[PDB]
Amino acid sequence: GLKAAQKTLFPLRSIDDVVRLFAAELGREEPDLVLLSLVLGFVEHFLAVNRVGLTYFPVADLSIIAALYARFTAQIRGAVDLSLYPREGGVSSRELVKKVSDVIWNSLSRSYFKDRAHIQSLFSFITGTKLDSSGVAFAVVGACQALGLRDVHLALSEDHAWVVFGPNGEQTAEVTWHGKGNEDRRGQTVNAGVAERSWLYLKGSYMRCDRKMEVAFMVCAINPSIDLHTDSLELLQLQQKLLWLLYDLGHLERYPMALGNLADLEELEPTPGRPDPLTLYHKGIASAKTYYRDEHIYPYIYLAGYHCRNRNVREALQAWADTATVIQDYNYCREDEEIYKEFFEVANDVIPNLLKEAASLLEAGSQGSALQDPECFAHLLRFYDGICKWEEGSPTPVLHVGWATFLVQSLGRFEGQVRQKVRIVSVEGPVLTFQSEKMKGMKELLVATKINSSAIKLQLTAQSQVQMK
Amino acid sequence: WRFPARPGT
């Protein structure tokens, strides 16, 4: 499988030698996904899993990498007989895709913890017979490239992975599992999930990778974690350098989450002469607006998290309001629980702890406080509005009374004189228009000096009665 | 377990 020109950089003796290999592969007609994943997995294993004996960098010798490569290509070519699945037109068939998915599936250990770190790469698949959920999808695409199936590509939402293939690349197939205790759909299209307007399938506004974006995925999949307290500096540096190489070649243009990841890495350790983290977070949002109909949630959660860490309360609230403005046009469905958890934590933990500190700082005489800024109160209201609108039409409810005490407490962090300055207008000063029926009914409770806690709870939830006695 | 490039920890 490996061509002479792919071998000349070995041995890889440094981070920068790995970067050179990626640059060389990205300059070829198609970068070799199997080679590149094996190399990343090898160095991650010796930098994060087992650092015994490490003195600088785990040298990657050609003999070792080539033998791993051979183990993979042998196991795919032996198990998938292409003659059984004739290809017209440089297009693969659904049966062929399912066969490759079965080969990868059936290779995995019978029982293992699927949520472990460092089981994402082909190095893990060969040496441990273990892959995580999205790692199975990647492995299917790398197997298909090894078989010459140029039309098979990785598809990505914000929480799941599958493949596209076939005439004009228009077919979809499930090739891995999603979540825990969901029923397998391997072999099926993603059309039911698109049609139901779930977050999981992004209303069809998901990423369809080319081979360069598949390289970007494996780079984002690097896991620098050594343990709960400690990251590998070496792997952070490697990931950051590889993402800049991809950025410079144009291959992050259509990958919002990769742009957020790079921004996070720049915040941790800035690269001289590169854009600031904010610039990169805003490029991620621009990418989602340009290529994905502004239907992605995480570009705004990346931005909000940066503002939250920097105790920019105003801009954090604005970014979470913008997050909610995206979610409002989805239906909350059965496998969307990750984004539910993201909204729950923001509403019921992160915002409360931000406003509590702001309240203490205001007591100590801070000026320009978010708590005295009616535009900040309007952002809080717009955040709840989008969550309430999300719930409308959904097959499963979102809000419950466990949300209501936090809402009442957060509203209460703003004095009545501040809250009074927002004008809520119906379809001077801040003006806000509510989309959700729940918030429209809430409007007259929002300006009293002391909020009517009980009334708020009734309005936010399905509860319509108070206690009998 | 975190989906590649998901924000936050």
Query: A135, B2 in Cβ contact below 8 A?
Result: no
A183 touching chain B per CB within 8 A: no
Closest CA to A338 of A461, A157, A210: A157
Smallest CA–CA distance from B1 into chain A, residue: A115
Beta A230-231 vs A171-173: how paired, if at all? unpaired
Distance (Å, whole) CA A171 – CA A410: 47
Residue A180 to residue A168: CA distance in whole angstroms: 33
Please tell me if residue A440 touches chain B, with a CB cutoff of 8 Å.
no
Tokens of A195: 């049609």
Phi and psi dihedrals of B8, rounded to 5?
A: 75, 180
How far apart CA A2 and CA A7 sit, in angstroms, is 7
Q: Give the C-alpha separation, A119 to A129, whole Å.
A: 9
Q: Is A260 exposed, middle or buried (0-12, 13-18, 19+ CB in 10 A)?
A: buried
Contact between A246 and A216 under an 8 Å Cβ cutoff? The reply is: yes
Q: How was this structure obtained?
A: X-ray
CA–CA distance, A96 with A98 (Å, rounded to integer): 5
- Pairing of the two strands A153-156 and A171-173: unpaired
- Cβ-contact A162, A190 below 8 angstroms: yes
Q: Which residue of A has its CA nearest to B4?
A: A221
Question: Is A29 exposed, middle or buried (CB count within 10 Å of its CB: 0-12, 13-18, 19+)?
Answer: exposed
- Whole-angstrom CA distances from A256 to A48, A300, A326 are 26, 10, 15
Distance CA A347, CA A302 (A): 16
Count of Cβ atoms closer than 10 Å to residue A181 Cβ:
4
d(CA A416, CA A175) in angstroms, rounded, equals 54
Per-domain residue ranges for chain A? 4-226, 326-469
Which of B3, B4, B8 has the CB atom closest to A301's CB atom? B8
Closest residue by Cα to residue A162 from A142, A143, A140, A193: A140
**Is A158 in Cβ contact with B1 (below 8 Å)?**
no
**Which chain B residue has its CA at the smallest distance from A342's CA?**
B8
Taking an 8 Å cut-off on Cβ atoms, the answer to whether B4 and A217 are in contact is: yes
> B1 in contact with A at a CB cutoff of 8 Å?
yes
Alpha carbon distance A70, A320 (integer Å) = 48
CB contact under 8 A, B1 and A117: yes
**Chain A nearest CA to B1, separation (Å):** 5
Alpha-carbon torsion A432, A356, A343, B7, what sign?
positive
A118 phi and psi angles, rounded to 5 deg: 70, 25
Contact criterion met (CB below 8 Å) for A120 and A131: yes
The single-letter code of the amino acid at A185 is R
The Cα angle at residue A280 between residues A284 and A346, in degrees rounded to 5: 65
**Cβ B6–A221 below 8 Å, yes or no?**
no
Query: Is residue A212 within 8 Å of residue A249, measured between CB atoms?
Result: yes
* Domain at A4-226, CATH from 3.40.50, 1.10.10, 3.10.620, 2.160.20: 3.10.620
Using omega within 30 degrees of 0 as the cis cutoff, is the peptide bond preceding A374 cis? no
Alpha-carbon distance A100 to A112, whole Å?
21
Mind giving me the DSSP string for B1-9? ---TT-S--
Chain A neighbors of B1, CB-CB under 8 A:
114-117, 132
3-state secondary structure chain A: CCCHHHHCCCCECCHHHHHHHHHHHHCCCCCCHHHHHHHHHHHHHHHHHCCCCCCCCCCECHHHHHHHHHHHHHHHHHHCCHHHCCCCCCCCCHHHHHHHHHHHHHHCCCCCCCCCCCCCCHHHHHHHCCCCHHHHHHHHHHHHHHCCCCCCEEEECCCCEEEEECHHHCEEECCCCCCCCCCCCCCCCCHHHHHCCCCCCHHHCCEECCHHHHHHHHHHCCCCEEECCEECHHHHHHHHHHHHHHHHHCCCCCCHHHHHHHHHHHHHCCCCCCCCHHHHHHHHHHHHHHHCCCCCCHHHHHHHHHHHHCCCHHHHHHHHHHHHHHHCCCCCCCCCHHHHHHHHHHHHHHHHHHHHHHHHHHHCCCCCCHHHCHHHHHHHHHHHHHHHHHHCCCCCCCCCHHHHHHHHHHHHCCCHHHHCCCEECCCCCCEECCCCHHHHHHHHHCCCCCCCHHHHHHHHCCCCCCCCC
Rounded alpha-carbon distances, angstroms, from residue A241 to A15, A234, A257: 9, 11, 16
CA separation for the pair A215, A30 (Å, rounded) = 10
Contacts of B3 in chain A (CB under 8 A): 134, 158-160, 338
Interchain contact A101–B (C-beta under 8 A): no
Cβ distance of A220 and B5 shorter than 8 Å: yes
* Residue in the block written with tokens 């900040």: A376
Backbone angles phi, psi at A226, to 5 degrees: -95, -45
CA distance to partner chain B, nearest, from residue A116 (Å) = 6
